[PDB]
Design a protein around this ligand. Structure first.
Ligand SMILES: COCCOCCOCCOc1ccc(C(C)(C)CC(C)(C)C)cc1
Ligand SMILES: COCCOCCOCCOc1ccc(C(C)(C)CC(C)(C)C)cc1
Ligand SMILES: COCCOCCOCCOc1ccc(C(C)(C)CC(C)(C)C)cc1
Ligand SMILES: COCCOCCOCCOc1ccc(C(C)(C)CC(C)(C)C)cc1
Lengths: 143, 143, 143, 143
């Protein structure tokens, strides 16, 4: 069905399309950030928040995809297809996964209002042509 | 990390493997049920329930897996590897996905207490000898 | 030392001497039932109950016996004696293990009074000849 | 289930590994002690103590193992396999059995605090180099 994984929280794929695809940190970086800030809450038997309830499932999906990639690499004796599949995973599913991880980790760390205002402001910045684009882009911070 | 997709809901993979893998309905049946009964809520911008959140994320993951399988069927030439990947997906990931969808739908419908009692009773039943167990398999009913 | 493992609990080998060998689930089934229902309590540092203590000790005994059977299969080169010892172990020791595990699990699940009354009634039933006893044995179930 | 038979009593397999394997007395000696000191309590119909429960179960297991050994000696004819099985049973299984019997008897007789302090002191001793290791090895006493 047509499910948006953000409108449950107050955003949309059209609002996160302000951020380009080359903007999102790597999956390793984001998973390390999660392990750092919310490992004890993701490994807890509590609905601490919908962000947790969703981030757990996203991490489980990524883990299943990694198991798929290993299984492919070990079973399939066709390096061409092996590489094709692994690259497709790590690129497309990686992009989607890190979009979702960015959104959740940010709305947890900083806040819904702050994150939405940041998306709007970054859209302003990235629509503004370069000749009039300040260099001090918007950068989420607690400082 | 060490995340259990059930322990925030009060269960565990050890408790759901207590049932056979040949018991859980097909993914198509479970998705049709989910649509029929909770489309207006899964397509809603509300934290209706942790079950709704987790189920949205699971459905998104299954959609991405289906896209992967279709992309494989299109691009990958080697039919052996292609069919092998598709079969692995639909079998392993299918089993996990339908276990989780069964859990979530059944909870939303009947109750967590009911579903856990059903897991326990059905496991004990299918493990008990027939001459000393009730002859008709347990089943969940709102009727 | 003339010990009865059930006298401490209110039963006797003479009360469970009627339950046939086909009345008890397999050892794997009973161990799975235990791991599903009371794993977090058997792996706990608490004197949760005498049933938990006895279950722990019985499971350790069975683990050591399975270790013995494996060591036999690995270190004995006479298949006759090897299979004979493994068969003795499984059949006899697992019959006793099934008796004990069943008693403990059923007590924990239903109740001491319930289980003792069920044993009395099953004895009444199994002592009666088939020409005068009902064909459907008594049944203990949460359903 | 990965169960530690001392966790519910306040110890661990790594706290008892301070004690060597050549430290624990013969199973005959330990069973003689157990008889002399707690026969009427082990044969009793009471949850006198979790120690008594575990001791009853351990004694039942040792009895079943002795029965296995006699059955082997009488049925099996291959002297190699017969002696191998009996020797493995005695050495290994009785080593574990006398570990557990020592723990339970000692706790019942002296005290939990006393036994734990004895384990740590014996660790101190067996770790201390010989040139500074007093010959008066630690020993349990009620005096
Ligand atoms: C290739 O990237 C396209 C960029 O546009 C993204 C549009 O989709 C929005 C995000 O959608 C999803 C879909 C699925 C997922 C899940 C949770 C299933 C994770 C995944 C992709 C790792 C399987 C996350 C986000
Ligand atoms: C072949 O599977 C054997 C049984 O697996 C038991 C569960 O394994 C632990 C992880 O379980 C899940 C369950 C569901 C899922 C989701 C919902 C994310 C869907 C899936 C399987 C399509 C990735 C992921 C992991
Ligand atoms: C062959 O079995 C016949 C049925 O048993 C008749 C006597 O029943 C008494 C059962 O006594 C025991 C003895 C030992 C045990 C332990 C706990 C030691 C377990 C075992 C048999 C797995 C070693 C349990 C019950
Ligand atoms: C070969 O022994 C090696 C040393 O043992 C290390 C600790 O092992 C953990 C399990 O310990 C026990 C101890 C006793 C027992 C009982 C009492 C059940 C008796 C036995 C060994 C006869 C089965 C079971 C497991």
């Amino acid at each position: 069905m047509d499910i948006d994984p953000y409108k449950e929280f107050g955003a949309t794929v059209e609002l996160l399309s302000f951020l380009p695809s080359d903007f999102f940190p790597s999956v390793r970086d984001l998973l390390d950030t999660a392990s750092a800030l919310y490992r004890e809450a993701l490994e807890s038997p509590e609905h601490c928040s919908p962000h947790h309830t969703a981030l757990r499932q996203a991490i489980l999906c990524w883990g299943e995809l990694m198991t798929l990639a290993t299984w492919v690499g070990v079973n399939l004796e066709d390096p061409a297809s092996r590489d094709l599949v692994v690259s497709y995973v790590n690129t497309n599913m990686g992009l989607k996964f890190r979009q979702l991880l960015w959104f959740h980790i940010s709305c947890l760390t900083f806040g819904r209002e702050t994150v939405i205002e940041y998306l709007v402001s970054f859209g302003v910045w990235i629509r503004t042509p370069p000749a009039y684009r300040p260099p001090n882009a918007p950068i989420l911070s607690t400082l």
